[PDB]
Each structure stands twice: as C-alpha cells, then as structure tokens.
Amino acid sequence: MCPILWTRNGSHCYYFSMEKKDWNSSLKFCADKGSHLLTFPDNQGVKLFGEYLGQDFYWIGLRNIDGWRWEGGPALSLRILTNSLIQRCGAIHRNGLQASSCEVALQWICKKVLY
Amino acid sequence: MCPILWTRNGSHCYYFSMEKKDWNSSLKFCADKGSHLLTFPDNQGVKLFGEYLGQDFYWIGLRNIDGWRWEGGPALSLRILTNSLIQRCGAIHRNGLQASSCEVALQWICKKVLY
C-alpha cells in the first residue's frame, strides 16, 4: 500500500504537502522521495482531479522552459491561465491550471506508482 | 530533434558536459534546462550505457540521503563501489557505479524527452 502520509487513487500514491516550497524545492522533495511532481502526460483529467482540491494552489510538474511542457512528458495541450508572460511554473487548484512565478512558495503534490 | 550540444539515443536526448561541477550544481544545471540528472530507475542498463564512457566519472542522479536511491526513482539495487561510508553521491564510468564526495567536481549527464 501507499507509504504513511501518502494518499492512494487508482494505481498511484500521491503526496499532498502541508508545507509550502518554491517550485525548485518542491521538485527536490518529490525526487528525494522516489517520486515526481504531479503531471497529466495524457493531457487529461485536470478538471476531474481538481475536484478534490480547493482554491489554494499546488505546484505540479509543469513549466515553460522551452514551451509549456509536462516534466519528463509531452507538451502542454491544455490551457494554463497565464496572467504575466514571465511566469514559467505551473500550479493546479479546483478551477484548473495557472502559471505563477517559480519563486512563490506553494504546497505541492508528488506522484508515484503503488508498489 | 535534440537541441544542439545534446545527443540522441532512442526516445531521449542526453547532455554530456565538458566542464565539471559538484553534484548539487550538476543537478541544478539539468533542472534549469528542463531535464534531469541521469538515472536508471529500473535498476538496469548501467553496464550497457557505460560502454559509451571511459575511465572519467560523470555525476548521475544517484544519492544516499535516506539510503542509496535514484532521484525520482526507487532504491538502488545495483552495487555501487563505495570505499568510504561518508561518500553520498553517485557517479558512472565505463566500469560501473562508484560513490564519491558530493563536493568533487565532475562532468555530468542530463537526460530529457526527445521532441
């Protein structure tokens, strides 16, 4: 089953942080825990997944370094609310995807398969 | 195709550095380029991949913070030559995996999706 503090859904385990970290640090945390920041490589399920969240944002594995792309995955085909061109990190909340400065400290979500 | 300076192999692009950096700086370099320090999450393929290398070592995403583990992956199941217990960072060369002080400046290898 999923490790303590993690949450199960389907065939994966998710970690919803309580603490807030900037994007780089959120990535390190997931990486150190044998996981990756949350991604939707199929470019589907964001709204559905968002139904378990509220208005607060969570960092996910989405950035615009060479165009918006899922970390380790394909390009983003979904709309991401981008208020300013300089925002290169993506976050998720109930109402969808939204860009933010990568320096903002937000909770984050890690994902890994249930062993 | 892979950007200039990068090399293709199958479904991914790799970056073999010429300059040397300590482990944290190498990890950071790959992350900032929308890639990650090389890992073998399936715990196989090290020897084969090493056939393209020589004696010089390259930093990879293998570290011992809470046991030897692949960043974003499972625990290490392959042997890593560790002559000193305090060496917490892993590197690769032709002959396999070897632990080293994380302060050593070595070349590094980044890995990202081919697009």
SS3 A8: strand
Amino acid, res. B78: L
DSSP collapsed to 3 states, A47-64: HHHHCCCCCCCEEEEEEE
End-to-end CA distance of chain A: give it in Å, rounded.
7
Q: Does B112 contact A72 at a Cβ distance shorter than 8 Å?
A: yes
- Resolution (Å units): 1.8
B4 part of contact set with chain A, CB < 8 Å: no
Residue ranges per structural domain of chain B: 1-115
From the list B88, B92, B85, the residue with the least C-alpha distance to B102 is B88
Q: B49 CB contacts (<8 Å, ≥6 apart)? A: B40, B92
> CA-CA distance, B79 to B76, in Å (whole number)?
8
Q: Within 13 Å of residue B54, how many CA atoms lie on the same side as its CB?
A: 3
Give me B109's structure tokens: 């290898």
Best mutation target among A12, A26, A28 (most B Cβ atoms within 10 Å) is A28
Copy the structure tokens of residue A17: 């942080």
Breaks, C-N > 2.5 A, in chain B lie after: none
Using CB atoms within 10 Å of the CB of residue B37, give its burial: 0 to 12 exposed, 13 to 18 middle, 19+ buried. Answer: buried
CA–CA distance, A98 with A83 (Å, rounded to integer): 8
Experimental method: X-ray
Contact A69 B34 (CB under 8 A): yes
SS3 state at B80: coil
Residues near A90 by Cβ (< 8 Å), separated by ≥ 6?
A59, A60, A62, A63, A64, A68, A76, A80, A97, A98, A99, A100
CATH match for A1-115 among 3.40.50.300, 3.10.100.10, 2.60.40.420, 3.40.50.1820: 3.10.100.10
